[PDB]
Amino acid sequence: SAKAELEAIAKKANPTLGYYDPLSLADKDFWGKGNDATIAFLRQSEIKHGRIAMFAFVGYIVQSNFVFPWAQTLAGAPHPSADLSPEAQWDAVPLGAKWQIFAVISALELWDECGGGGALPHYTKGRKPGQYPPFTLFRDNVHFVLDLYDPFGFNKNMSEETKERRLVSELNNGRLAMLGIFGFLCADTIPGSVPLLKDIAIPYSGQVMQPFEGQFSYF
Amino acid sequence: KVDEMPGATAPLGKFDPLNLATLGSESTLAWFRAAELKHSRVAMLATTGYLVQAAGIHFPGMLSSDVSFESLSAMKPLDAWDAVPEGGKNQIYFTIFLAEFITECKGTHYTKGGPLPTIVFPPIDFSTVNPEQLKTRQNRELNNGRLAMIAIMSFVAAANIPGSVPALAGNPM
Amino acid sequence: ATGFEEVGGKPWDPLSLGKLEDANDTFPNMFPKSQYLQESEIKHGRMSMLAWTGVWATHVGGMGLGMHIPGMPVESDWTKALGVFAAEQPALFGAILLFISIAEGESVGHSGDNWRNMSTKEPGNLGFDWMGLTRKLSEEQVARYKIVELKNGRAAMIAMASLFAMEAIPGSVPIMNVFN
Amino acid sequence: GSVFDNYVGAKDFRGAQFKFDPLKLSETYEPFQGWFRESELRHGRTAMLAVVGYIATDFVRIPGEMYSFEAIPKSADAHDALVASGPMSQLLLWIGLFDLVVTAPAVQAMGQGEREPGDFGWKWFAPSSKDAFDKKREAELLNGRLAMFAIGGIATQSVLSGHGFPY
Ligand code: CLA
Ligand code: CLA
Ligand SMILES: CCCCCCCCCCCCCCCCCC(=O)OC[C@H](CO[C@@H]1O[C@H](CO)[C@H](O)[C@H](O)[C@H]1O)OC(=O)CCCCCCCCCCCCCCCCC
Ligand SMILES: CCCCCCCCCCCCCCCC(=O)OC[C@H](COP(=O)(O)OC[C@@H](O)CO)OC(=O)CCCCCCCCCCCCCCC
Ligand SMILES: CC(=O)O[C@H]1CC(C)(C)C(=C=C/C(C)=C/C=C/C(C)=C/C=C/C=C(C)/C=C/C=C(\C)C(=O)C[C@@]23O[C@]2(C)C[C@@H](O)CC3(C)C)[C@](C)(O)C1
Ligand SMILES: CC(=O)O[C@H]1CC(C)(C)C(=C=C/C(C)=C/C=C/C(C)=C/C=C/C=C(C)/C=C/C=C(\C)C(=O)C[C@@]23O[C@]2(C)C[C@@H](O)CC3(C)C)[C@](C)(O)C1
Ligand SMILES: CC(=O)O[C@H]1CC(C)(C)C(=C=C/C(C)=C/C=C/C(C)=C/C=C/C=C(C)/C=C/C=C(\C)C(=O)C[C@@]23O[C@]2(C)C[C@@H](O)CC3(C)C)[C@](C)(O)C1
């Protein structure tokens, strides 16, 4: 089943490429959980990395472009620079403000994975037969409408012939901008600037995998 | 039967020239099976535990009260075994001494057809993992151990006899 | 599985010490009933499993263990280690002795006479099944771990008899002259 | 037996059924189920005050020489520099006294079935129903259980760090 379900959607992303599997990673246990939770976890991860990817690349361009002027912190408040590297605009974020960025993600990462309740309905399915799903229920606590992925609802008008043009595209759309990150974000760390890439964040950023540039260490 | 057994791969198939699988009963072959399974896992951890302990990976802090991790910026990885103190060497054996018990005290012992030695702590539910792809892994597990049983003997012979191994004698160990 | 695998599958009572109190009418209730003998054997076994491990974990050097709680008194042998601890730490020694005194008194206070078969409890059943074990296990395992506790109690009682004999008779157990 | 349909509070952060009895305590110690609830309600209330009571003390301090910021720099030390002078002996005397004359007769009346556990007679604002009173009870249980972990972190990190309100 699980091997057959990729080969149905292999031949839709690229019929010349087709079924891509030399490292044989989609048939086999992670922590010991079986084939049906194998593909759906890898069909999971390939788009979570890709959903951030489109949202990174659009997020990169506008920070190289026009910066955002107001008061950012309560005292001083200068808003780190316009032309300057969004790479190290991320490091020029204050120490406090990085935590609430990470904590609201963890509020959404706690949100994505639980499973349906034993006395009330709260959550969707996980990886047993689940898809790669959205969040779909934002009404469970005392809050107002900030439905995630749904600002101004209207997605109620497309059928199963038409939704496959939106799933499989974003697969390939998310793979482009994923390569669009590392094709650029290496080109600041190294010179080499894949075809030609020059008027840029001119030193290296400094440990792009670092959440926190300076304040606390571990030794 | 040597046919239908993980460990029989493509380049040799049934590798038994001196006919040792026939030498006893079926209970005999099951003993040699999980011997090689256990000989593998010790040698895989010792070969990999030789390569690091030689490049300077170096746990931060103190191993014991005064014999902290200077055992790596010093003596060879074949050494630093008497440098580990006795109470430190003792709990290693006894965690192993405990781990050899659940291995033996299952409901069915493996020479009576029971299961191979499983993980002592955090035993995920296990190889409910698609038995076609289970057979490919137990070939992977044993072959890496076959290579590691040779390799850990290479690492001992290089530490005793200099020049006993050509493209490996020019290595500081 | 039976508890008798080392004596031939049969109840090992040479010298008939369980049959006494019933052989004759001549001492009316002066020998213990089966229920009292069964709790004594479990209790002697449980105290011996703790005490052997205690003298084994505090022996320094040799095979030894030399493990030592920080702040307690350093004493080489186990023979004098109680009286040193009793003098130096009165509050800790008094709280352990009170805890042992209450729990051991509570063992018999709620149940009937043990010396006579009138107890209404299983022997060895102190209310310490906190882990919730035997409420999750099945009856074959629960009956099995009782025998495991018994024989390990029995191996430790013979150990404690060896540990007593080596210090009263210097050549008594020869496997420890060498072992130290 | 089966404490879960004998009481309330078998709910996680959501309100779905959780049934948190891993060690089977309420089955092995079945006559102590009322005492278990009584203690948990006691510990919870103590924690909910001692959370709030604590960390709201780095802002305000009642007037007086010892109270107002003089010999007591932080909120966390406030024990064993105040024990000697009297207010800890005074507050031990009453919490003691109260515990020695009314809540020990109260827990005597629980075991005879003459008292619901954790009652004390503070029926001023109860919704006076069955579905709504359980929801108030659950909201008390779920808050009190969080306050136990709360001051467990707040008292530990303030000896370690020594900082103000974010410890
Ligand atoms: C490509 C893979 C990769 C690599 C190589 C690293 C490497 C590292 N990660 Mg990281 N990480 C990764 C992927 C990766 N990450 C991913 C995918 C995630 C998930 C989002 C994380 C999440 C993560 C977290 C949450 C944290 C790290 C941290 C670290 C650092 C740990 C060692 C340390 O403390 O050194 C010292 C730290 C550095 C060299 C980097 C920051 C340097 C600052 C500016 C100070 C430099 C001064 C001084 C010389 C060094 C430290 C002193 C100290 C007093 C500050 C190290 C540089 C930790 C870290 O950096 O905290 C400081 C940390 O908290 N990682
Ligand atoms: C678990 C509860 C608890 C405990 C043990 C303490 C303990 C302490 N507090 Mg504290 N406090 C608490 C809760 C608590 N507080 C709460 C909830 C508040 C907010 C009002 C305060 C506000 C507070 C201040 C402003 C100060 C202290 C101070 C002190 C210290 C000296 C004693 C004193 O003057 O108390 C004073 C206590 C109060 C003014 C309020 C206590 C209110 C109690 C909890 C009411 C509940 C019981 C009540 C009798 C029930 C009546 C209900 C009715 C229907 C019958 C001492 C370490 C002083 C100090 O030295 O600081 C370090 C000080 O200046 N506390
Ligand atoms: C180095 C090793 C040492 C560290 C290891 C810790 C030691 C092991 C744990 C010891 C536990 C003692 C056995 C349990 C006794 C508790 C009795 C009880 O609570 O219910 C017994 C009573 C409950 O009373 C009952 O109430 C019922 C209503 O539900 C009915 O009315 C019953 O009739 C009535 O008996 O609770 C009381 O304590 C009330 C009297 C107060 C005085 C009791 C004596 C003091 C107890 C202190 C010891 C507590 C031990 C701590 C618990 C674990 C330790 C982390
Ligand atoms: C789940 C059940 C657990 C069972 C426990 C057994 C395994 C435990 C492993 C870890 C012990 C941790 C205790 C911490 C204690 C602690 O860390 O102290 C540290 C202590 C260090 O003592 P040293 O004398 O080195 O210290 C002196 C200095 O510290 C003073 O300067 O090490 C021990 O004593 C080693 C314990 C080995 C004990 C062997 C156990 C029993 C098996 C015996 C079987 C062999 C003979 C029979 C063969 C047939
Ligand atoms: C079988 C079993 O039970 O085990 C379990 C254990 C456990 C833990 C449960 C499991 C797990 C989880 C695992 C293993 C997760 C691993 C995750 C991992 C490994 C995540 C890396 C991210 C790296 C990034 C994003 C790098 C960015 C790098 C960037 C952005 C760079 O620029 C690199 C950089 O170099 C440049 C290009 C230029 C230089 O100038 C500077 C620097 C250095 C910045 C598994 C899988 O289940 C297995
Ligand atoms: C003569 C001279 O001069 O040249 C030298 C050349 C050279 C090359 C140096 C020599 C050599 C020998 C070599 C290269 C020897 C290498 C030997 C080898 C191959 C050693 C592998 C060990 C495997 C390990 C540690 C894996 C553990 C894996 C563990 C602990 C797991 O977690 C299992 C795992 O499955 C789970 C349960 C979950 C799964 O999700 C996946 C993972 C992995 C997580 C010689 C012969 O000496 C001579
Ligand atoms: C080697 C090492 O280092 O380990 C350490 C840790 C270790 C092992 C923990 C150590 C210890 C301390 C120990 C052993 C302490 C022991 C304490 C002990 C033994 C405490 C009993 C309380 C009994 C109660 C409250 C009974 C209530 C009984 C109740 C509530 C009942 O009504 C029972 C009832 O049954 C009826 C009548 C009928 C049933 O139908 C219904 C139920 C079940 C409800 C050491 C010595 O320090 C060593």
Tokens representing B64 are 């014991």
Residues of C with CB under 8 A from a CB of B: 65-67
Tokens representing A144 are 């107002």
User: Which of D6, D32, D112 is the best mutation target for the ligand 3 pocket, counting ligand atoms within 8 Å of the beta carbon and taking the most?
Assistant: D32
CA distance C173 to C163: 9
- Cα D91 to ligand 2 centre (Å): 10
Residues of the domain holding D56: 1-167
Contacts with C138 from chain B: Cβ below 8 Å? none
Compare all CA atoms of chain A with the CA of B134 and give the residue at the minimum distance.
Answer: A28
Could you count the other beta carbons within 10 Å of the beta carbon of residue A143? 8
CA distance C39 to C124: 5
Q: Please, which chains are in contact with C (at least 3 CB pairs closer than 8 A)?
A: B, D
Instruction: Classify residue D37 as exposed, middle or buried by CB count within 10 Å of its CB (0-12, 13-18, 19+).
Output: buried
Half-sphere exposure of A158 (CA within 13 A, CB side): 10
Domain total in chain D? 1
User: Which ligand has its closest atom nearest to the C-alpha of D110?
Assistant: 3
Q: What is the resolution of the experimental data for this entry, in Å?
A: 2.4
CA distance A56 to A159: 30
Place of tokens 């491990």: C53
Handedness of CA D106, D107, D112, D115 (dihedral sign): positive
Which residue has its alpha carbon closest to ligand 3 atom 33?
D111
Handedness of CA B74, B78, B80, B82 (dihedral sign): negative
CA distance D92 to D80: 13
Using DSSP, state whether A153 is helix, strand or coil. coil
> For residue D72, how far is the Cα from the chain centroid?
25
CB contact under 8 A, C132 and D29: no
Tokens representing C104 are 């051991």
Could you count the other beta carbons within 10 Å of the beta carbon of residue B138? 15
CB B136 within 8 A of CB B129: no
Could you count the other beta carbons within 10 Å of the beta carbon of residue C167? 11
CB A122 within 8 A of CB A137: yes
Q: Which residues make beta-bridge pairs with D17?
A: D11
Ligand 7 atom having least distance to the Cα of C121? 37
Q: Is A142 on the interface with D (CB under 8 A)?
A: no
Please indicate whether residue D110, judged by its CB atom, sits closer than 6 Å to ligand 3. yes
Contacts with D22 from chain C: Cβ below 8 Å? 132
CA distance A48 to D50: 43
Which of C126, C135, C142 has the highest number of chain D CBs within 10 A, making it the mutation to test binding with D? Answer: C135
Size of interface C-D (CB pairs under 8 A): 18
Could you count the other beta carbons within 10 Å of the beta carbon of residue B140? 12
Residue C159: closest CA among C56, C89, C87: C56
Which of D24, D27, D30 has the highest number of chain C CBs within 10 A, making it the mutation to test binding with C? Answer: D24
B11-29 in b/e form (b: 16+ CB < 10 A) is: eeeeeeeeeebeeeeeeeb
Using DSSP, state whether D11 is helix, strand or coil. strand
Calculate how close chain C gets to D25, using CA atoms only, in Å.
6
Q: How far is CA B105 from CA B99, B108, B117, B123, C103, in A?
A: 10, 8, 10, 16, 35
Contacts with A26 from chain B: Cβ below 8 Å? none
User: Which of A106, A182, A189, A210 is the best mutation target for the ligand 1 pocket, counting ligand atoms within 8 Å of the beta carbon and taking the most?
Assistant: A210
CB D152 within 8 A of CB D22: no
Report B:118-137 residues touching A (Cβ under 8 A).
124-130, 133, 137
CA distance A112 to A123: 8
Using DSSP, state whether C8 is helix, strand or coil. coil
Tokens representing C155 are 């191996």
Compare all CA atoms of chain B with the CA of C65 and give the residue at the minimum distance.
Answer: B87
Size of interface A-B (CB pairs under 8 A): 26
Contacts with D11 from chain A: Cβ below 8 Å? 119
